[PDB]
Structure formats: structure tokens, C-alpha cells
């Protein structure tokens, strides 16, 4: 029983401990910045044991990263398993895909869940314990009674469900955030194996802040066209290589003055890697890093090749990358302002409008803070789940029948209470 009180200290304190892991990674990488080759060795313009300060801090860091995967497993794993059990129960009761439709070889995210319906603790974290008999009553008359009832279904160590628990571990290991935290801990351990690994925990300013996410979200939602623009740059630079190999390969002398044992680009791969390593990153095209036309036969064709290189790579394509970033900023801000418009011009639930609730002096604020006020529907749903089914009033048992029926008439469509009467 003391384990559980110790264990509601991890889950209570996940966020602060996660931020503390990030600060400890800052301090360790800062201390790591005073390296030197001599084999690697650390000097000390500090207090007496700053190599044992790293020996303290790396151990404290691996302790804390394990400490927060414990905290995550006891804080945000019940919600993942609640969403998964919720979706499996609401796909049996109203679609019956394991009873009627049999999910395909595609979507293993659903076909893995075949190993939890057969289990005997299926609605653990879902507060709707009657899923078994409700499926038996809905389908067990046409699709056979005993078939559905058979499809559904140290001494303390042999009292837990093994199949359900293996299903739980299967859902957890396929989660994104838990896989990330396991990665974080294994890089802490490999940081004990080698102190230079510890720098890859600087990756957690991305997946750990707020405004850093609102800056990286100006790339990461506009990413398919960014990747495709880089790929199109590769193809355009390839076609320039196809020209430059086949008419121009006597201008490529990397070597000094030609008396030296001269290197050229008259292979195909080396000319192409020359273009994508030099011609794109030169700023002035490729007529920067090349022998120049000095009255040769191909001088004008060479000038046209170079200037169209400069436009169609350096001006236009790099402007497409930069304009794509800037438009990602614009679209993100347009979303964040559309939300404010649809929360200050319509109601959420009754969906009326704003000129109707303002014939009252100062009235739409009262309408979305007392009449409907979204939190009170949340509190009412918490109320109906919490009571017993016998103890409902008339309205609560009606609304409760609708909610177990999952049909959703009873929220106001376009008909607030003021509109009803006069």
C-alpha cells in the first residue's frame, strides 16, 4: 500500500519532473562544451570536482528520465487505454465489425484489438461494464446466442488476466509519446555508455515547449510541399547536369592552373554531386565556381546556361521555400483568428447568432455563461454517469436513454430557451 502512495507522486509530478530532465540535460551539455582533444579530456575553471559533477549529473539524469517514464505510465496511459476501449466498445455496439464486418488486413490498429474482446476484463477503464450483455442482446438473436456468448466469453500472480495485459502492453508500445520517452531513457543510458550521446536530449525543446512549437508549426504542417520542393530542386539540378555533362565538361577544372594533375567533372555522378554541393550553395549560381567563358565558342550558350541556372534555382526555388514558410505563418494565424470569430459571433451549442441575444442589454455574454456555458454540459454528463440507473429523474433518465442510445437529438439545434417563449 506504500507503493501506491509513492506512485501517486510520479503521476502527480510528471510535468515538473519532465522539465527538470530538460534543465539537467542543458547543464550536462553545457559542461560537455568544455572538451578538448589531447583521447578526450575536461579541464576545470570551476570548483574542485567538475568531472564528478558530470558523474553526479548523468546518473541523476538517467534516474529522472526513468522516473518520468514511470510518471507517464501512471498518468497518461489510463487515458490512452480509455480512448482505445471506448472506440472498441462503441464499434461493437453500433457497428459490430467483429460480429458483422471483420476488419481487413489493412488497419492493424483495429485488427490487434481482436485479442481483447475475448478477454475477461474488457471494460476496465471505461465505466460502461455492460458492453458484453449489450452486444449479446443486440446481435445474439440472429447471429446465434452461443457463438456470441463464446466469442465474448503465486496465486495472486495467477489471478491477473494475461491476454488483456499483453493487449495493454501492445497498445502502449505502439503509442507515439511513450515510444519517445523510451527513446529518451535509452539515450540517457547510452549517455552513460558515452557522454557525447547526452547531447541529443537537446531535441526536447521541440517536443517540450509552447512557443517553440508555434514556431516549428510554421514548418511541420507545411512539410509535404517543402519536401517536394527540395525534390524538384534535385530534378532541376539533375537536368542541368545532363546539359553540363554533354556540352560543357571542359570548363570544370577544380585544380590550380592545369599544370597541376587536373581533376574534372566528366563522370556523371561526380558532376551531379558537384552541382548539388557547389552550384546550389554558392549564392551566385554556378558561374561563380567554374572556369569562365573567355571568348570561347560556347560563350553565349554558357552565359544563357548560367543565368537560367541562377534564376531557376537560386531566385525562384529558394524563394518558393521561403514563401512556403511565410505562408505557413499566415495560414496558422488565420486559423487562430477564425476560432475567435466563431466564438464571438455564434453560440457553440444552440448555434444561433449574435443579433438575437443582444436585444437584451449585454446578453450574449449571459447566454454563453449561464444559459448553455459548455462546462455545464460536461458537468451534467458527469452527473448522469455518476448516479445509479434507478435513481434518475424523468429528464435525467430520458437524456440517459438518449446517451446510451448515442443519437444526440437533445442538444438544442437552433432553438434556445428565449426563442421558445415570448
Amino acid at each position: 500500500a506504500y507503493q501506491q502512495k509513492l506512485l501517486n507522486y510520479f503521476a502527480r509530478n510528471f510535468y515538473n519532473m519532465r522539465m527538470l530532465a530538460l534543465f539537467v540535460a542543458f547543464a550536462i551539455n553545457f559542461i560537455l562544451l568544455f572538451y578538448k582533444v589531447s583521447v578526450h579530456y575536461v579541464l576545470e575553471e570551476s570548483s574542485g570536482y567538475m568531472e564528478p559533477t558530470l558523474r553526479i549529473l548523468a546518473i541523476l539524469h538517467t534516474v529522472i528520465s526513468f522516473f518520468c517514464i514511470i510518471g507517464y505510465y501512471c498518468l497518461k496511459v489510463p487515458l490512452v487505454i480509455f480512448k482505445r476501449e471506448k472506440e472498441v466498445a462503441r464499434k461493437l455496439e453500433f457497428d459490430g465489425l467483429y460480429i458483422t464486418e471483420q476488419p481487413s488486413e489493412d488497419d492493424i490498429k483495429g485488427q490487434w484489438d481482436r485479442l481483447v474482446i475475448n478477454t475477461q476484463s474488457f471494460p476496465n477503464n471505461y465505466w460502461d461494464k455492460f458492453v458484453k450483455r449489450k452486444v449479446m442482446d443486440k446481435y445474439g438473436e440472429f447471429y446465434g446466442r452461443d457463438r456470441i456468448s463464446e466469442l465474448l466469453g503465486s496465486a495472486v500472480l495467477n489471478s491477473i488476466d494475461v491476454k488483456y495485459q499483453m493487449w495493454k502492453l501492445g497498445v502502449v508500445f505502439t503509442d507515439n509519446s511513450f515510444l519517445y520517452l523510451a527513446w529518451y531513457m535509452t539515450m540517457s543510458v547510452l549517455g552513460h555508455y558515452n557522454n557525447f550521446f547526452f547531447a541529443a536530449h537537446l531535441l526536447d525543446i521541440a517536443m517540450g515547449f509552447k512557443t517553440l512549437r508555434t514556431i516549428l508549426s510554421s514548418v511541420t504542417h507545411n512539410g509535404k510541399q517543402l519536401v517536394l520542393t527540395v525534390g524538384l530542386l534535385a530534378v532541376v539540378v539533375y537536368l542541368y547536369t545532363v546539359v553540363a555533362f554533354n556540352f560543357f565538361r571542359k570548363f570544370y577544372n577544380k585544380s590550380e592552373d592545369g599544370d597541376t594533375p587536373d581533376m574534372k567533372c566528366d563522370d556523371m555522378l561526380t558532376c551531379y554531386m558537384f552541382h548539388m554541393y557547389v552550384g546550389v550553395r554558392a549564392g551566385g549560381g554556378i558561374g561563380d565556381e567554374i572556369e569562365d567563358p573567355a571568348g570561347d565558342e560556347y560563350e553565349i550558350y554558357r552565359i544563357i546556361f548560367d543565368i537560367t541556372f541562377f534564376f531557376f534555382v537560386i531566385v525562384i526555388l529558394l524563394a518558393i521555400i521561403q514563401g512556403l514558410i511565410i505562408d505557413a505563418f499566415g495560414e496558422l494565424r488565420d486559423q487562430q483568428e477564425q476560432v475567435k470569430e466563431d466564438m464571438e459571433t455564434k453560440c457553440f451549442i444552440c448555434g444561433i447568432g449574435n443579433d438575437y441575444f443582444d436585444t437584451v442589454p449585454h446578453g450574449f455574454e449571459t447566454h454563453t455563461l449561464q444559459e448553455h456555458n459548455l462546462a455545464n454540459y460536461l458537468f451534467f454528463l458527469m452527473y448522469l454517469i455518476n448516479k445509479d440507473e434507478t435513481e434518475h429523474t424523468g429528464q435525467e433518465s430520458y437524456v440517459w436513454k438518449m446517451y446510451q442510445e448515442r443519437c444526440w437529438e437533445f442538444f438544442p439545434a437552433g432553438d434556445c430557451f428565449r426563442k421558445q417563449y415570448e
Binding site: 466564438m343 454540459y377 460536461l378 451534467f380 452527473y383 437524456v399
Partner: protein, 155 residues
């Protein structure tokens, strides 16, 4: 009780003569509260759901408003606890429903976190939500938030 300015003095004598006079001059805090407060609060809440439902349903009447300003110190205390929604209650007019918001459910909703999950949800619905599936999104958010609260008030 005289220092705390709340009570008129005859009622201070009433709360003195009420309690226990437990064998010297003593009285329990908790075993005088639990026997003059649980039941009291319960009845008060139910009565508030009655007076409020009369005032909200039958407005513009002098007599009920006179009686309600006669009875204000219960409706003030039970305003953080009663919530009122509007639904369509099978007579195809629109009824309103009263109920009892708890306390941990009230101080759990906004903590730093669920107050931010709510604006994440609102940002999801206006972005990609429809005419038809909107309220079924809102109840999926409701069930997830309720399970998060059922956790975070037992930690």
C-alpha cells in the same frame, strides 16, 4: 462566533444552546457540523433548485421576487453548485434541467491543464468539424475530460 461578525446575538445563544455542552464546556467541531450541516446542506440545495426553477420559469411576478429577495442567503451559497442546461425533453418544447455540480469537479476543470485542453478542442472543431458530427465530437471530448478528472482528483 462573536468575533467573526456573522451572527446576530440571539442566534449566537441559539447555536450555543443547540450543540452539546459536552461535559465541561466542550463541543466537537466535526460532530456538531456533521449533525447540523450535512442534512441542512442537502435540503438547502434541493430547495434552491425549487426557488430558482420557479424564478427562472415564472418571471415578471412581484410576489415571487419579493419572496426570493426574502430568501437570498441560500441562493447565494448554492450558486457555485447548481448548473442548468437546456435540452429537448420529448414534449418537443425545450425544457431546462437542473442538477448538482460537485466540488472536486468544480475545482478540477480549470487547473492549468484542462483549461488548455478545452481551447485545443475548440480549435479542432472550428477547423475541421462539420454540421452533423459536431455534437458527437463534443461528447467524445466530454467523456475524455471526465475520465481525466476522475483520475486527477484521486491522485
Amino acid at each position: 462566533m462573536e468575533s467573526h461578525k456573522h451572527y446576530t446575538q440571539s442566534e449566537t445563544e441559539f447555536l450555543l444552546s443547540c450543540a452539546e455542552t459536552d461535559e465541561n464546556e466542550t463541543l466537537d467541531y466535526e460532530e456538531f457540523v456533521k449533525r447540523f450541516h450535512e442534512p441542512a446542506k442537502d435540503i438547502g440545495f434541493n430547495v434552491a433548485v425549487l426557488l430558482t426553477n420557479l424564478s427562472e420559469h415564472m418571471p415578471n411576478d412581484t410576489r415571487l421576487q419579493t419572496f426570493l429577495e426574502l430568501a437570498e442567503s441560500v441562493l447565494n451559497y448554492f450558486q457555485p453548485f447548481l448548473g442548468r442546461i437546456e435540452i429537448m425533453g420529448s414534449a418537443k418544447r425545450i425544457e431546462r434541467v437542473y442538477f448538482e455540480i460537485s466540488e472536486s469537479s468544480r475545482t478540477q476543470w480549470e487547473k492549468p491543464q484542462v483549461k488548455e485542453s478545452k481551447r485545443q478542442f475548440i480549435f479542432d472543431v472550428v477547423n475541421e468539424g462539420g454540421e452533423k458530427e459536431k455534437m458527437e465530437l463534443f461528447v467524445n471530448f466530454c467523456e475524455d475530460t471526465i475520465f481525466e478528472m476522475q483520475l486527477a482528483a484521486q491522485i
